[PDB]
Amino acid sequence: RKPFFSVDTYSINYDILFRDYFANGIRDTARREYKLLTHDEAPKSGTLVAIDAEFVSLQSELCEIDHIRPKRTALARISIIRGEEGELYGVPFVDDYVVNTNHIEDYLTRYSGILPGDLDPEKSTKRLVRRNVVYRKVWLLMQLGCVFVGHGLNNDFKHININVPR
Amino acid sequence: KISKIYQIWSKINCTNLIKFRDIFQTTKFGNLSICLVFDYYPNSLSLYDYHFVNFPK
């Protein structure tokens, strides 16, 4: 007979949004970069950011339609940019490639155009892992009222396994 | 056309024509392959096997 409680009732850390944390440390392809958040550009409710992930498939299947399991993907690349009008309008804060442990079947360069950039000494990126860092980032941006613009995001969120609301 | 072949040989009925059982294009050898099955008969030979290729003649 005890009730459930949420973390929206709680007080959550947010500073991982306002800094980087990556064990690649090469940080090359220093473009108009994944520029770090500060609390002047702290996230809000109702606000908008844009987002685009590139995927790779990692599964072998069978014929499955003829009158070893059916193929599914995993994430390869993520770029989340400030969609709000400002000095960092469209400037990324996430351009992170995947610290992927096991073997990856498809590079999907026709769908993703990876180098493959998922090398640890040959990063040329903030080769960063989801395990509690950027999944927490996207999860908190979901949590705070930062809507996610972009293209075809539905099955993208599915393959992420995030369930972004309406 | 796969169903059409299923018609053309599932109705093919004889004795020396060994009966078409079924076909399937798998991906199990690594590649794709349209594997068909028939009935195993023990000790399959030709007449040239039965005399000339294999002992005896």
Q: Which residues of B touch A (CB under 8 A)?
A: 2-3, 24-28, 32
The bridge status of strand A47-57 relative to strand A73-81 is antiparallel
Structure determination method: cryo-EM
Annotated binding site of A for a divalent metal cation: 52, 54, 156
Can you tell me the distance from the alpha carbon of A114 to that of B38, in angstroms, rounded to the nearest whole number? 47
Can you tell me the distance from the alpha carbon of A103 to that of A99, in angstroms, rounded to the nearest whole number? 12
By CB atoms closer than 10 A (0-12, 13-18, 19+), residue A141 is buried
Among residues A75, A42, A43, which one has the least CA distance to residue A156?
A75
Q: What is the dihedral of CA A41, A45, A51, A53, to 10 degrees?
A: 110
Report the run of H or E that residue B26 belongs to, with start and end. strand B22-27
Among residues A166, A130, A161, which one has the least CA distance to residue A148?
A166
Q: Calculate how close chain B gets to A55, using CA atoms only, in Å.
A: 24
- State this model's resolution in angstroms: 4.8
Plot region of A106 (φ>0 → left; ψ -120 to 50 → alpha; else → beta): beta
Contacts of B3 in chain A (CB under 8 A): 67
Q: Calculate how close chain A gets to B12, using CA atoms only, in Å.
A: 20
Q: Are B3 and A67 in contact (CB under 8 A)?
A: yes
In this structure, how many other beta carbons lie within 10 angstroms of the beta carbon of residue A47?
14
Q: What is the DSSP letter of A130?
A: I
Q: How many CA atoms lie within 13 A of B28 on its CB side?
A: 7
Q: What is the CA radius of gyration of chain A?
A: 18
Contact A66 B24 (CB under 8 A): yes
Report the run of H or E that residue A157 belongs to, with start and end. helix A153-160
Q: Are A130 and A150 in contact (CB under 8 A)?
A: no
Beta strands in chain A (DSSP E): 47-57, 73-81, 92-98, 126-128, 146-149
Widest CA span in chain B: 44
Residue A50 tokens read as: 């844009």
By CB atoms closer than 10 A (0-12, 13-18, 19+), residue A157 is middle
In this structure, how many other beta carbons lie within 10 angstroms of the beta carbon of residue A162?
14
Q: What is the dihedral of CA A76, A107, A122, A28, to 10 degrees?
A: -60
Contact A63 B27 (CB under 8 A): yes
Q: Are A160 and A53 in contact (CB under 8 A)?
A: yes
Tell me which residue in A61, A63, A68 faces B25 most closely, judged by beta carbons.
Answer: A63
Contacting A residues, span 48-77, partner chain B, CB-CB under 8 Å: 61-63, 66-68
Report the run of H or E that residue B23 belongs to, with start and end. strand B22-27
Can you tell me the distance from the alpha carbon of A27 to that of A38, in angstroms, rounded to the nearest whole number? 20
In this structure, how many other beta carbons lie within 10 angstroms of the beta carbon of residue A156?
20
